Every structure is written in C-alpha cells, then in structure tokens.
Amino acid sequence: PKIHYRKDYKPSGFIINQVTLNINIHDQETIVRSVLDMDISKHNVGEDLVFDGVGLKINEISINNKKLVEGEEYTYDNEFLTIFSKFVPKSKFAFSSEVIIHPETNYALTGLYKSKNIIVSQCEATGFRRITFFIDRPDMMAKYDVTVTADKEKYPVLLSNGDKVNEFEIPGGRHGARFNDPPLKPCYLFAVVAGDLKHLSATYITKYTKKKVELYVFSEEKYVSKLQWALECLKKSMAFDEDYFGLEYDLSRLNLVAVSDFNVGAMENKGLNIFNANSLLASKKNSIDFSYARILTVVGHEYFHQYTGNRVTLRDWFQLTLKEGLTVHRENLFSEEMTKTVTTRLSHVDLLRSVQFLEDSSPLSHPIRPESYVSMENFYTTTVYDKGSEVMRMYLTILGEEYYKKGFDIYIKKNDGNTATCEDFNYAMEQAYKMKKADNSANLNQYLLWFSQSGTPHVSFKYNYDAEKKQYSIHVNQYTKPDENQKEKKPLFIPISVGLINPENGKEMISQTTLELTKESDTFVFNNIAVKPIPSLFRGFSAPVYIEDQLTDEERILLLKYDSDAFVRYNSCTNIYMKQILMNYNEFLKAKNEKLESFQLTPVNAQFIDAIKYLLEDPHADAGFKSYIVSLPQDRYIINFVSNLDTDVLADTKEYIYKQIGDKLNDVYYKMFKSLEAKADDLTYFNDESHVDFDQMNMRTLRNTLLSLLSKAQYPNILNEIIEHSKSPYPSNWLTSLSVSAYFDKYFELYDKTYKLSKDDELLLQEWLKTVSRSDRKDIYEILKKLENEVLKDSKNPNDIRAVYLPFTNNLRRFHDISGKGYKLIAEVITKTDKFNPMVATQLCEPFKLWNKLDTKRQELMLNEMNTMLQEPQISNNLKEYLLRLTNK
Numbered sequence: 001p002k003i004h005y006r007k008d009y010k011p012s013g014f015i016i017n018q019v020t021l022n023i024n025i026h027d028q029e030t031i032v033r034s035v036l037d038m039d040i041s042k043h044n045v046g047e048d049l050v051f052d053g054v055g056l057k058i059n060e061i062s063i064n065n066k067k068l069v070e071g072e073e074y075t076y077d078n079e080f081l082t083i084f085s086k087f088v089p090k091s092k093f094a095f096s097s098e099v100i101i102h103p104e105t106n107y108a109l110t111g112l113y114k115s116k117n118i119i120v121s122q123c124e125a126t127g128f129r130r131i132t133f134f135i136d137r138p139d140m141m142a143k144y145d146v147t148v149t150a151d152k153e154k155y156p157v158l159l160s161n162g163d164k165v166n167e168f169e170i171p172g173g174r175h176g177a178r179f180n181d182p183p184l185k186p187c188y189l190f191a192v193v194a195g196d197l198k199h200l201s202a203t204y205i206t207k208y209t210k211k212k213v214e215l216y217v218f219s220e221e222k223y224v225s226k227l228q229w230a231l232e233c234l235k236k237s238m239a240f241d242e243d244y245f246g247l248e249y250d251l252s253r254l255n256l257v258a259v260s261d262f263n264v265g266a267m268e269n270k271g272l273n274i275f276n277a278n279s280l281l282a283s284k285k286n287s288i289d290f291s292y293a294r295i296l297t298v299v300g301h302e303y304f305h306q307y308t309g310n311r312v313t314l315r316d317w318f319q320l321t322l323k324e325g326l327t328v329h330r331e332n333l334f335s336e337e338m339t340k341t342v343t344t345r346l347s348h349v350d351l352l353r354s355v356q357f358l359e360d361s362s363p364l365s366h367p368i369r370p371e372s373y374v375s376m377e378n379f380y381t382t383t384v385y386d387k388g389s390e391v392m393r394m395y396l397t398i399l400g401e402e403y404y405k406k407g408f409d410i411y412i413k414k415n416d417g418n419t420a421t422c423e424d425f426n427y428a429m430e431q432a433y434k435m436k437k438a439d440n441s442a443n444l445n446q447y448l449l450w451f452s453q454s455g456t457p458h459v460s461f462k463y464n465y466d467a468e469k470k471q472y473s474i475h476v477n478q479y480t481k482p483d484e485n486q487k488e489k490k491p492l493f494i495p496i497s498v499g500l501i502n503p504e505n506g507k508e509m510i511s512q513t514t515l516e517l518t519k520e521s522d523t524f525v526f527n528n529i530a531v532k533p534i535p536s537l538f539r540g541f542s543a544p545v546y547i548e549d550q551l552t553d554e555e556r557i558l559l560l561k562y563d564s565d566a567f568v569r570y571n572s573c574t575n576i577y578m579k580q581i582l583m584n585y586n587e588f589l590k591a592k593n594e595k596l597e598s599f600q601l602t603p604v605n606a607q608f609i610d611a612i613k614y615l616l617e618d619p620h621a622d623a624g625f626k627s628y629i630v631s632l633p634q635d636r637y638i639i640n641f642v643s644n645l646d647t648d649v650l651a652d653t654k655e656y657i658y659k660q661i662g663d664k665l666n667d668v669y670y671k672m673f674k675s676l677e678a679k680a681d682d683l684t685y686f687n688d689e690s691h692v693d694f695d696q697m698n699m700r701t702l703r704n705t706l707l708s709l710l711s712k713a714q715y716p717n718i719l720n721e722i723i724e725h726s727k728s729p730y731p732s733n734w735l736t737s738l739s740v741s742a743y744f745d746k747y748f749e750l751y752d753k754t755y756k757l758s759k760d761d762e763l764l765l766q767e768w769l770k771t772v773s774r775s776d777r778k779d780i781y782e783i784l785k786k787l788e789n790e791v792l793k794d795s796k797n798p799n800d801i802r803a804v805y806l807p808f809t810n811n812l813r814r815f816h817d818i819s820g821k822g823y824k825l826i827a828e829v830i831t832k833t834d835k836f837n838p839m840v841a842t843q844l845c846e847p848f849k850l851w852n853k854l855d856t857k858r859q860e861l862m863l864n865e866m867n868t869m870l871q872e873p874q875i876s877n878n879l880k881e882y883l884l885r886l887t888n889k
C-alpha cells in the first residue's frame with residue numbers, strides 16, 4: 001500500500017510542454033487522442049517513462065509516430081503505463097495515444113462523466129489520469145490545445161479552457177470546437193463540458209486595465225431562471241478582489257456551469273468553474289435562505305482561486321492548505337464585507353470549534369500540512385480548509401491591514417506564474433513583518449509550526465489587579481496535548497486580540513491591542529488601569545485555540561451584555577452554557593450510575609436568563625446574534641469537553657436546560673415571533689431576483705429558531721402558528737413548519753403538503769429530504785425506510801444520498817440508539833455507496849469520527865460497524881485508508 005512522504009518531493013525526470021487533445025464523444029464510448037510534446041529534465045537519471053492512467057482502454061500508443069508494442073516496449077496494469085527506458089528518447093520527443101473511456105458509466109464522478117444529460121470533467125486531484133495518460137501531479141505545467149466533438153442535437157454547447165478558436169460541422173450530425181489555452185497550467189485545472197446548456201450573461205469591465213470580460217452562467221433549460229443570483233455574486237467577487245487586493249481578472253471570458261451530480265460544492269477550473277447545482281442555483285420561491293449565502297460563498301471562493309491556486313499554483317499536494325486555507329480566508333473577508341452581519345464570522349467559528357476541533361482531537365488529527373498520505377483525497381479536510389483559513393487569517397491579525405496587503409502583494413508578484421509552497425507564503429509575510437517591526441532581524445520562523453504541529457492549543461489565563469498601583473496583569477499559558485504526530489509539542493506564535501472593559505460603565509479602557517504570545521507562558525502588564533477590568537480575550541476569535549477565560553459567570557454576563565466584540569459576547573454565552581451543561585450532565589450521570597430514586601439538578605443561572613431577555617428585547621441588537629444566544633452549543637463542540645460521553649445523558653441535560661430557560665422566556669419568545677413577522681416575511685422584493693437582504697434572512701432564522709423552541713415546549717396554541725407558517729411563500733418558513741410539527745399529530749399532513757410543494761424542483765426536493773431526515777420524530781427509522789422506498793430508491797446522486805442520511809446522524813437520541821441500529825444503518829449505506837463512489841462513501845463516514853469519545857457501549861457498537869466495513873472484500877482504497885486511520889489500526 002503506497003505511502004507518499006512530504007519530505008520525499010523530487011522534480012520529475014520528464015517535462016511536458018504541450019498537450020493536444022481530441023475528445024470525441026459518442027453514444028456508447030468516448031475516444032480520447034492526445035499528443036504530449038515532451039522533454040528530458042535536468043533531474044532525469046535514465047529511468048523508465050511512467051504515466052498515470054487509470055481505467056483507460058488502449059487503442060494505440062506511439063513515440064515520434066512509431067507505434068509501441070505491448071509487452072516488448074510498454075506494460076499497462078490499469079494504473080500505470082510504463083515505457084521501458086531503452087525505448088524513451090534522450091531529447092525532445094512526442095508521445096501520443098488513443099484511449100477509450102466511458103463517461104455514461106462513470107458513477108464515481110471523477111475524470112469524465114455524464115451528469116443527467118451533460119458530459120463534464122472533474123480532474124482535481126487525480127482525475128485527469130482517468131481521461132488520458134499523464135504525469136498527473138501539479139508541478140507538471142503545460143500548454144493545452146483541446147478539440148471536443150459530439151452529436152450536435154444532444155450536445156450543442158461545448159466548452160473547455162482558453163479561447164474558442166474554431167467551430168466546425170462534422171458529417172453525421174456532429175460538430176466540433178477547438179480551444180487554445182496558451183498560459184501554463186497543471187492538469188487538475190483542465191475542464192471540458194458538453195451539453196444542451198442555457199445561459200445568462202453579462203459584461204464586466206475591470207478596474208484598472210478596463211478589460212471587457214464576458215461572464216456566462218450555464219444550467220439545464222429547466223433551471224436557467226435560477227441563475228441570476230450567481231451572476232450578481234460573480235460581479236461582486238470580481239469587484240472585491242479589485243478593491244481589497246488590487247487584483248483583476250486576466251482572461252476575456254469566465255464560465256460558471258451547474259451540474260446535478262457532483263462530489264463537492266464546486267471546482268475552480270481556469271475560466272470554466274463547475275458547480276454542484278446546489279451551490280449555484282437559487283430562486284426566492286424554490287430555495288431556502290441558506291442557498292443565498294452558500295452561492296455567494298462558493299462563487300466567491302472559486303473566483304478567488306484564479307489568483308490563489310490557479311495563477312499561483314501548488315508544487316505538490318502537501319501544499320493544499322496554501323490554496324484552500326488561503327482561499328477560504330479570502331472568501332471569508334469577502335462575505336464579511338458583502339453581508340455586513342456578525343453572523344458570517346460567528347458561523348465560521350461555530351464550524352471550526354465543533355467539526356474541526358473534533359477532527360483535531362480524533363485519531364484522524366493532522367497538521368494543516370500533513371507529512372504523508374495514501375489517498376490525497378482524504379486530506380480535503382476541515383483541518384486543511386478551516387484551520388488553514390484561521391492560520392491564514394492570523395497573518396492579517398498580526399500585521400494589520402496595510403502590511404498584510406503589502407505581504408500578500410509580495411506573494412503574488414514573486415509567485416505569479418509558478419508553483420509555490422507554504423514557506424513561500426510565510427516568506428512574503430515575513431518581509432512585511434520586518435517592514436512593520438522596523439527591523440530586518442525580525443522573523444516568522446516560529447510561525448511555521450502552525451503548518452506542521454497538529455492538535456488544538458489550549459490557552460488559559462490568570463489575572464491580578466493592584467488597586468493602589470492602578471496596574472493590571474494577564475498571565476497566559478499555552479498547552480497542546482501530545483498526540484500520535486508529535487510526542488513533544490512546541491509553543492506557537494499566538495496573537496491574542498484583547499480589550500479591557502470597565503465593569504462600572506461598560507466602556508473600553510485601552511486601545512486595540514494584540515498580545516503576541518510566543519512562549520509557553522508570559523505575563524502582560526498594563527499601567528494606568530483605574531479600576532479592575534473584565535478582560536475581553538481573543539476578540540474576533542484571534543487564534544484557533546481552546547480558550548479557558550477563568551471568568552465568573554457574573555463577569556461573562558457583563559461581557560455578554562456590554563462588550564463591543566461579537567465573538568467575545570458569543571463566547572461568553574457559550575462558556576456560561578458549557579459550565580451548566582457539564583454540571584447537569586454530571587448530576588444526571590451520577591443519578592443513572594447510582595440508580596437513584598431521587599436527586600437534584602442545579603438550575604440555570606437566573607441572571608444569565610435575565611441577560612438573554614435583555615438582549616432579545618433590544619431592538620437595536622442583531623437578529624442573527626440573538627439566534628445564537630438562545631441556542632445551546634453544538635453537540636460536536638460539547639463532546640470535546642466530556643470523556644465517555646453518554647449521548648442519552650447529554651440529551652436529557654440539553655432538554656432540562658432548554659426547559660429551564662423556556663419556563664422563564666417562552667412568553668418573550670412568543671411576542672418576538674409575532675413582532676418580527678412583518679419585517680422577516682416582507683414580500684416587497686420577492687419577485688426581484690437580485691435583491692438579497694442578509695439581515696432579513698437572519699430575522700427569519702430567529703423566527704424559525706423561536707418557533708422550534710415554542711413547539712418543543714408545547715406552548716399554548718402554537719399549532720395554530722405552525723399551520724399558518726406552512727402557508728408562507730418562503731421555503732425556509734414552510735420547511736420549518738414541517739420540522740416543528742414533528743411534535744404534533746399534524747406532522748404527516750405537513751409532510752404531504754410540503755412534499756407536493758417540493759417534488760417538481762430537484763434541489764428543493766433535496767431540501768425537503770434533509771428536513772424529513774432531521775425531524776425530531778420517534779418513528780424516524782420507519783420514516784427513513786419510507787424515504788428509501790418512495791423517493792431515494794437506487795439514486796446514485798450524491799446530493800440525494802447525503803440529504804436522506806446525514807441530517808439524521810445529528811439526531812442525538814435516535815441515531816445513537818443503544819441497540820446500534822443507527823450505526824448499522826449508516827454502515828450499510830457507506831458500503832453500498834463505496835461500490836460506485838468511494839469519495840461520497842468516505843463523506844458518509846462522518847458520524848463515526850467521534851467513536852472513541854462516546855460511552856464504552858457505544859464505542860464498542862461503532863467499532864464493530866467499522867470493523868465490519870473494513871472486512872468487505874470489495875472495499876475501496878479510499879475507504880479502507882480512512883477507516884484504518886480512524887480506528888488506529
């Protein structure tokens with residue numbers, strides 16, 4: 001089983017200068033002819049010429065137009081084509097081949113495949129070798145000249161990278177298009193699309209060069225009306241890159257294409273970005289509110305790769321975080337600017353601290369630049385993306401905007417063209433650090449540990465105030481737990497954005513200050529502090545760490561009410577909830593363990609409840625922020641704090657705490673649900689396709705969150721509200737009506753009603769499926785069986801399979817049923833999917849990531865299922881590597 005090591009990187013002994021492809025799409029097969037103009041590099045040591053080529057049917061191969069003979073001059077084993085060195089030229093030569101591939105039966109959705117009636121490619125990371133022979137690694141940069149031919153009636157729209165330089169008719173009802181793409185690119189950025197596509201288009205004129213750029217967005221005909229928001233998003237993304245970074249698009253056209261069958265959200269092929277339809281298409285009538293933020297995010301993200309990933313390339317796959325972490329960071333700056341709500345930053349933190357912290361405390365834990373892989377597809381992770389994004393964001397925190405922009409421009413100017421590594425970026429940032437610190441002895445050598453050290457730092461605090469001296473001290477310690485990657489962990493460069501709040505008047509006591517913690521511990525002292533402050537620590541969540549603030553609940557409530565920083569207020573609320581959860585959880589567990597007939601539970605802090613009411617009733621406070629404060633921290637955040645987590649005991653603990661708070665605030669929640677209606681559900685702009693109001697969507701989030709609370713509580717007559725809510729024109733409302741009706745006899749009436757409203761739009765039906773899947777129903781197993789039989793059937797569409805099964809895995813009570821029936825159900829789906837799509841089968845493993853953090857009975861049940869999956873004779877390499885790592889085997 002082949003392991004690749006980061007430190008083993010060596011340039012190839014071969015060079016590929018030019019790729020000339022002819023892709024001839026037929027009814028039963030596609031024929032790919034390719035000529036590679038090649039050379040011998042300075043690194044060559046007389047080795048065999050070995051190409052990647054997976055599942056290719058060879059018709060012929062040649063060197064310099066002389067046909068090579070199998071067995072004598074080459075061997076092919078369905079993975080590697082080896083041409084023996086004695087047959088390989090010692091100077092520039094041409095390698096040519098013709099192979100047969102079958103996009104119609106390519107259900108793995110990598111390489112060239114058919115999605116409904118569209119033929120489409122996906123090459124990142126190793127998909128190009130599934131289309132033709134290549135040295136399929138990102139440092140093999142080449143020029144591309146691509147011709148596609150197909151049946152004209154079936155496939156009128158033909159697209160690839162670069163300029164369309166010719167179009168032509170072919171006998172027998174066929175037609176062809178030639179595209180030439182002169183600038184060098186790695187092969188994972190190659191794309192081709194053939195289909196009966198419809199489009200919307202616009203022209204964008206760049207900021208400085210004043211280049212006219214043609215923008216096209218494509219879908220199947222049925223959904224072309226859903227393309228408008230994506231076109232607006234693309235204009236916004238171009239403007240932002242211009243305005244913040246001074247970066248203009250370089251090419252004359254940019255195409256975005258939506259397809260129905262896609263392993264991920266989208267892909268940044270140069271001038272030809274290809275999208276999961278769920279991340280490109282939306283309408284007010286047929287999409288939930290989340291679609292709007294998602295499209296903005298994904299269009300922005302793939303656009304931002306044009307510089308960070310495409311123009312500046314990766315040397316090798318170990319550098320993945322350099323394009324993905326940096327591009328997530330760019331999209332976050334963009335979306336914060338576009339949405340102007342604090343919930344954009346909060347939602348990123350909420351994801352990192354639940355999902356990524358869980359990964360980083362699991363057997364899958366890795367640094368953002370891993371040291372080895374077996375299947376690189378397994379390293380497209382929340383760590384590489386989201387922790388990578390936070391590491392990229394810490395440079396901006398450390399440097400500030402002016403110097404951050406200087407360092408980023410140094411990175412672009414020096415590397416445009418060109419493969420790069422994480423050190424290249426650190427080097428550019430360090431040049432700005434030197435400039436900022438006014439000394440050339442300053443360095444960021446220690447900062448590199450953020451790329452190589454796995455695990456989440458824990459940062460803890462002690463405080464001292466001397467009233468007589470007016471002097472305040474913050475003593476800080478950092479600790480990363482040893483793990484399987486490093487026995488010894490080193491101190492990181494941690495920037496700690498801080499304020500000091502005067503608790504008498506809630507005012508700021510110091511200017512903006514970022515403490516640079518670079519040792520295992522340090523004490524920061526402040527003079528002229530007139531009263532003992534409450535510290536506001538890690539403002540904006542300034543480093544990706546466990547924060548142990550050591551504050552009292554009274555201090556935390558004062559920050560929640562009065563602090564200026566959204567993240568610190570949110571975290572203070574989070575910390576109050578966590579202290580309560582851990583206390584009640586222990587009380588319930590002791591009662592269960594001791595089989596007690598009676599016992600006590602510690603009630604929720606009454607001043608905390610009063611603070612929630614205070615914020616909810618403030619008309620000037622943000623609706624998105626309000627929806628976070630009435631929600632308990634995510635289950636996957638909580639599990640990081642509990643050993644041997646008994647999921648039933650956690651479910652009882654959450655229930656008690658929600659009931660405690662609802663018993664005091666339900667009348668307030670009801671009054672707000674009613675009073676927010678006018679603005680939340682305003683229809684003034686319902687038929688304006690480009691008018692998108694993030695605040696209004698956050699008001700709907702709050703309304704729907706309050707409705708869920710009131711429905712769980714069986715608030716008097718709430719069923720009337722639910723039934724009326726089902727009549728709203730907004731899918732976020734009428735789908736909420738289905739899930740909150742789970743607690744009432746009207747559930748299956750709303751099931752049918754909303755099914756009928758959803759069934760005629762592919763993406764809306766997927767949203768309906770998630771809604772059913774996440775429904776808090778005691779008969780959820782029977783309901784999932786009905787979905788399988790009646791709707792999902794044998795669909796191989798990843799969006800369908802993920803919609804039915806993933807939301808259900810968050811059902812803390814039912815998915816973790818002590819019989820193990822939920823673990824069995826998901827393992828069956830995993831093994832079934834693995835037969836045709838190993839990548840999606842691995843995504844479906846997500847619920848097992850926390851297996852060793854549960855109570856011993858559930859650990860045993862999950863392990864048995866994973867061992868059963870591992871024992872499947874036909875298991876993919878991808879799935880096997882993932883399960884071997886996850887089970888420490």
Ligand SMILES: COc1ccc(C[C@@H](N)[C@H](O)C(=O)N[C@@H](CC(C)C)C(=O)O)cc1
Binds near residue numbers: 264266305331839
């Ligand atoms: C496992 O193999 C792959 C192959 C290709 C990719 C595509 C990757 N480059 C692309 O930028 C990407 O992740 N977008 C995200 C969306 C952003 C907004 C985070 C997605 O798709 O959900 C990924 C993995």
Ligand SMILES: [Mg+2]
Binds near residue numbers: 054055057100101102
């Ligand atoms: Mg094949």
Ligand SMILES: [Mg+2]
Binds near residue numbers: 207239242
């Ligand atoms: Mg502008």
Ligand SMILES: [Mg+2]
Binds near residue numbers: 297344347348
């Ligand atoms: Mg986000």
Ligand SMILES: [Mg+2]
Binds near residue numbers: 260762797
């Ligand atoms: Mg379908």
Ligand SMILES: [Zn+2]
Binds near residue numbers: 301302305323324327
């Ligand atoms: Zn990306």
